[PDB]
Ligand binder design. Structure first.
Ligand code: FAD
Ligand code: ACJ
Length: 465
C-alpha cells in the first residue's frame, strides 16, 4: 500500500493525478480541491444563445515538444472529434496587432523589414543586436534586457506589450531568465539573441495534422473546459479519489515520515504530496520546521486579471486577426483584446454574434486593489466597453456581457525567481521531504507548461517507492 495526495484540482493537479493513475503499478491517489469545481483557471461558460465564453485560456499552441505532449494527451483522452483548430491559412493565425497612437498596427510577420509605430528598422535594430554585449548578471528584467539589446522602441512597444499579453505583468519587474528562457539562453550561449535562435516531440495523428495544416492554436468545441472535464472523468474511472469543496488547511510530518494532510474537519495520510496549488498558499500550509521553504514560496506572488467577454449583434471588427495588445504607455488597465470570433466562428452561438474578450489588469487594477475602491462589476464592464469603443470602433452597446475578476491568477516571475526555486528545491532535497512542486507558480504559466509540470511530478513520485 502507498498513498499519494495531490493538492489542487487545476490543470496541473489533474495532469499529475492522471499520470500517476496510468502507471503500471499505481499508488492510491487522492486529489484534493478547495473549490466546488476542478479545472482552476480553465473555465468555459455556455451562454444563453449557445455561444462559448472562455474565462481563462481560450486556445493552446501546438508548437514545440510541450505542445506535442499536450496533443498526445488529447488523443489519449479521446477528444479528437472535439478539436477546433486555427489553420495556417487564416488571419487569426497570421495577424497580431498593437494599439498605439490612436490606431491598430500589424506586427511584422515574415522577414518584411518600414513598419509603424516603429521609427525605422527592425532590420537595423536586429543588426546591432548581433554585436551587443552579453549580460553578466545572473538575471535581468525583461525591460532592461530588451532596451539594452533591442533599443527603447522595441522595449517600450514590443516587449512591454508581450509581457502583458503573456503574464499580464510589468516588464520592468519580470525576469527575462524565467519569463523568456529562450531569449536569455540565446544571449548567454551564443552571445546574440538572433544569432542564437538561428543556431538552434512525441507523435500522433493530431500532431501530424497540426504540422501539415500549420495550426497556430486549437481549442475544443464545447469550450477548453472539456479538457479538465475529460481528465476528471478518466480519474473517477480509474478509481482515483477526488475531493471537492475541501480546502487543505495544514501539512505536517509524523510517524515514519508520512505526511498528515489536514482538511477542515477531516484528515488524510500521504506517503508523498504533490502540491499543485499556488506557492503563496502552500507557503502557509507548511509546518514550523519548513520555515525556510515557506519563505521561498511566499516570495512568489501573482497579479489579478479582470476578464470581460463582450458580444455584439451585427457588428464587425476594423481588421481581422488574433487580437491586439495595448502597451502600458497607452492604457495600464487594458492589457489587450482577443478577437474570439475570428479564431472560432463556430462558438458564436445562434443567432451568431461578434465576440471579443477584453483583459483588464496592470497598475490600474493593482492600485485599485490596494485602494479602498470597490472593485464592482460595473467598473470593469465600463472600462472594457470603452476600450472596445475606442480601440475597435465598436460604439454599439454590447448585447451580452460577462465580467469575472480573477484574483492572483497569473504568477509573476520577478528578478531572482530562479533563486526562489533553487532555494525551495535544495531545502526539499536536503531535508528529504516527501513533497513535490508543480503548477504555474514555478516553471511556466502556459497550460502546456502546467500539464508538463504535472507529468514531471508524477514521474519523479513514481520513481520513488
Ligand atoms: C484570463 C487568463 C487567460 C489565460 N490564457 C492562457 C492562454 O490562453 N494560454 C495558456 O497557455 N495559458 C493561459 N492562462 C494561464 C494558465 O491558464 C494558468 O497558468 C494555468 O491554468 C494555471 O494552472 P495551475 O494548475 O498551475 O493553477 P490553478 O488553475 O489556479 O489551480 C490551482 C487549484 O488549486 C486549488 N487550491 C488552492 N488552495 C487549495 C487547498 N488548500 N486545497 C485544495 N485545493 C486548493 C484552487 O482552487 C485551484 O483550482 C491564462 C490565465 C488567465 C487567468
Ligand atoms: O497571446 C497574446 O500575446 C495576446 C493576448 C491577448 O490577450 C490576453 C490574453 C491573456 C492574458 C493573460 F494571460 F495575461 F491573462 C493577457 C492578455 Cl492582454 C491579446 C492579444 C494577443 N496577441 O498576441 O495579439
Amino acid at each position: 500500500g502507498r498513498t499519494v495526495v495531490v493538492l489542487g484540482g487545476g490543470i496541473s493537479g489533474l495532469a499529475a493525478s492522471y499520470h500517476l493513475s496510468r502507471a503500471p503499478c499505481p499508488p492510491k491517489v487522492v486529489l484534493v480541491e478547495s473549490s466546488e469545481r476542478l479545472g482552476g483557471w480553465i473555465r468555459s461558460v455556455r451562454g444563453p444563445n449557445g455561444a462559448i465564453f472562455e474565462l481563462g485560456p481560450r486556445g493552446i499552441r501546438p508548437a514545440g515538444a510541450l505542445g506535442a505532449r499536450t496533443l498526445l494527451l488529447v488523443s489519449e483522452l479521446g477528444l479528437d472529434s472535439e478539436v477546433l483548430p486555427v489553420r495556417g491559412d487564416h488571419p487569426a493565425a497570421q495577424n497580431r496587432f498593437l494599439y498605439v497612437g490612436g490606431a491598430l498596427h500589424a506586427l511584422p510577420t515574415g522577414l518584411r523589414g518600414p513598419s509603424p509605430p516603429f521609427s525605422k528598422p527592425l532590420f537595423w535594430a536586429g543588426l546591432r543586436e548581433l554585436t551587443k554585449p552579453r549580460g553578466k548578471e545572473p538575471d535581468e528584467t525583461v525591460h532592461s534586457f530588451a532596451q539594452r539589446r533591442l533599443g527603447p522602441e522595441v522595449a517600450s512597444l514590443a516587449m512591454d506589450s508581450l509581457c502583458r499579453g503573456v503574464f499580464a505583468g510589468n516588464s520592468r519587474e519580470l525576469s527575462i531568465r524565467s519569463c523568456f528562457p529562450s531569449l536569455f539562453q540565446a544571449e548567454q550561449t551564443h552571445r546574440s539573441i538572433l544569432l542564437g535562435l538561428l543556431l538552434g516531440q512525441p507523435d500522433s495523428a493530431l500532431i501530424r495534422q497540426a504540422l501539415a495544416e500549420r495550426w497556430s492554436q486549437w481549442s475544443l468545441r464545447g469550450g477548453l473546459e472539456m479538457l479538465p472535464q475529460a481528465l476528471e472523468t478518466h480519474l473517477t474511472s480509474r478509481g482515483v479519489s477526488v475531493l471537492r469543496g475541501q480546502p487543505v488547511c495544514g501539512l505536517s510530518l509524523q510517524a515514519e515520515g508520512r505526511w498528515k494532510v489536514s482538511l477542515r474537519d477531516s484528515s488524510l495520510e500521504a506517503d508523498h504530496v504533490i502540491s499543485a496549488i499556488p506557492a503563496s498558499v502552500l507557503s502557509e500550509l507548511l509546518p514550523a520546521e519548513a520555515a525556510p521553504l515557506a519563505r521561498a514560496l511566499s516570495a512568489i506572488t501573482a497579479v489579478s486579471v479582470a476578464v470581460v467577454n463582450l458580444q455584439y449583434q451585427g457588428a464587425h471588427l476594423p481588421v481581422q486577426g488574433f487580437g491586439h495588445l495595448v502597451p502600458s504607455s497607452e492604457d495600464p488597465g487594458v492589457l489587450g483584446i482577443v478577437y474570439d470570433s475570428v479564431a472560432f466562428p463556430e462558438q458564436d452561438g445562434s443567432p451568431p454574434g461578434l465576440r471579443v474578450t477584453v483583459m483588464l489588469g496592470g497598475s490600474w487594477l493593482q492600485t485599485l486593489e490596494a485602494s479602498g475602491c470597490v472593485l464592482s462589476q460595473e467598473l470593469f464592464q465600463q472600462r472594457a466597453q470603452e476600450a472596445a469603443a475606442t480601440q475597435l470602433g465598436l460604439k454599439e452597446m454590447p448585447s451580452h456581457c460577462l465580467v469575472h475578476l480573477h484574483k492572483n491568477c497569473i504568477p509573476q516571475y520577478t528578478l531572482g525567481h530562479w533563486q526562489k526555486l533553487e532555494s525551495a528545491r535544495q531545502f526539499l532535497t536536503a531535508h528529504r521531504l516527501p513533497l513535490t512542486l508543480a503548477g504555474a507558480s514555478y516553471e511556466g504559466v502556459a497550460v502546456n507548461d502546467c500539464i508538463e509540470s504535472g507529468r514531471q511530478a508524477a514521474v519523479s513520485v513514481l520513481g520513488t517507492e
